[PDB]
Write a protein that binds this ligand. Structure first.
Ligand SMILES: [Ca+2]
Ligand SMILES: [Ca+2]
Ligand SMILES: [Ca+2]
Ligand SMILES: [Ca+2]
Ligand SMILES: [Zn+2]
Length: 316
């Protein structure tokens, strides 16, 4: 829409108050003009036709409970955009400030969220398994990281390349959560998962086996479900990334942690410089060792830690 950029205020899914960038033109719209070619948030009105209508509001105050998921989708897309710009020098998901679009209130009782290849889509959850999925910043950044992956490595969505594609989304979703300092942890989806049960989450990076995912290559899932285990075998990579960052001993192999920041730099370089559409886990190891070598030298601690972590999860 064409209009005057301004700032409105509302409440997100968890009840927290925040300011959001809106646009005025008779109505106030959820259209943020301050980031690249814009962040736009739509109302899909409980149906599955996308994108729905650009969210319009009469007074610029988004305190209605129907507004909550739109406030968070819009706000957390700007945080994700900031993270990639300030930390990785990347402008939006294509690297040229492409507009970011999200629709909320997709379908009824929908327990998922996804990047559909052109925009973000968020269900409201059924109220028991999930509450509105855009209340989770690691959920938002995870799915928006899929758009970065599609424009750079192009990892196909299955078998080991899809498990890498998932793990890269859990890694950057966690890093964005740490960057916003929103209660950060190494678990995924905990702010919006089962509101009646405290302390759980969809998946864990520090201990994937807590929810039944594999944490070593010898435990990988080899059947055909979940497109060959894309959401299951990502635990193996998630556990390696966690070790590289924080250190620990796993199946007897000791890894010295090198921190979150280096973790982000190594995996972003591996993603944008060395991974291809069909990379498998052994080629991710080679890509991460080359990246660490490029950045810190072949005899650095950082390279040694990337190798130990992959050894500890059994990836050669
Ligand atoms: Ca209003
Ligand atoms: Ca958290
Ligand atoms: Ca989390
Ligand atoms: Ca829960
Ligand atoms: Zn994903």
């Amino acid at each position: 829409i064409t209009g005057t950029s301004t700032v409105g205020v509302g409440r997100g899914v968890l009840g927290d108050q925040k300011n959001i960038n809106t646009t005025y033109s008779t109505y106030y719209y959820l259209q943020d003009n301050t980031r690249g070619d814009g962040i736009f948030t739509y109302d899909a009105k409980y149906r599955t036709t996308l994108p729905g209508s650009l969210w319009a509001d009469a007074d610029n105050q988004f305190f209605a409970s129907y507004d909550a998921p739109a406030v968070d989708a819009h706000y957390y897309a700007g945080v994700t955009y900031d993270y990639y710009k300030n930390v990785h020098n990347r402008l939006s998901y294509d690297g040229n400030n492409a507009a970011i679009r999200s629709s909320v209130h997709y379908s009824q009782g929908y327990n998922n969220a996804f990047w559909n290849g052109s925009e973000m889509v968020y269900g409201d959850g059924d109220g028991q398994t999930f509450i509105p999925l855009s209340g989770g910043i690691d959920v938002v950044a995870h799915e928006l990281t899929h758009a970065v992956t599609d424009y750079t490595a192009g990892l196909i969505y299955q078998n080991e390349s899809g498990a890498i594609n998932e793990a890269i989304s859990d890694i950057f979703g966690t890093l964005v959560e740490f960057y916003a300092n929103k209660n950060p942890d190494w678990e995924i989806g905990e702010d919006v998962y089962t509101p009646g049960i405290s302390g759980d989450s969809l998946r864990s990076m520090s201990d994937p086996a807590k929810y039944g995912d594999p944490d070593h290559y010898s435990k990988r899932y080899t059947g055909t479900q979940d497109n060959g285990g894309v959401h299951i075998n990502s635990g193996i990579i998630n556990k390696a990334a966690y070790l590289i960052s924080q250190g620990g001993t796993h199946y007897g192999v000791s890894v010295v942690g090198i921190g979150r920041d280096k973790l982000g730099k190594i995996f972003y370089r591996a993603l944008t410089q060395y991974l291809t559409p069909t990379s498998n886990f052994s080629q991710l190891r080679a890509a991460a060792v080359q990246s660490a070598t490029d950045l810190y030298g072949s005899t650095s601690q950082e390279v040694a830690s990337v190798k130990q972590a992959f050894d500890a999860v059994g990836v050669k």
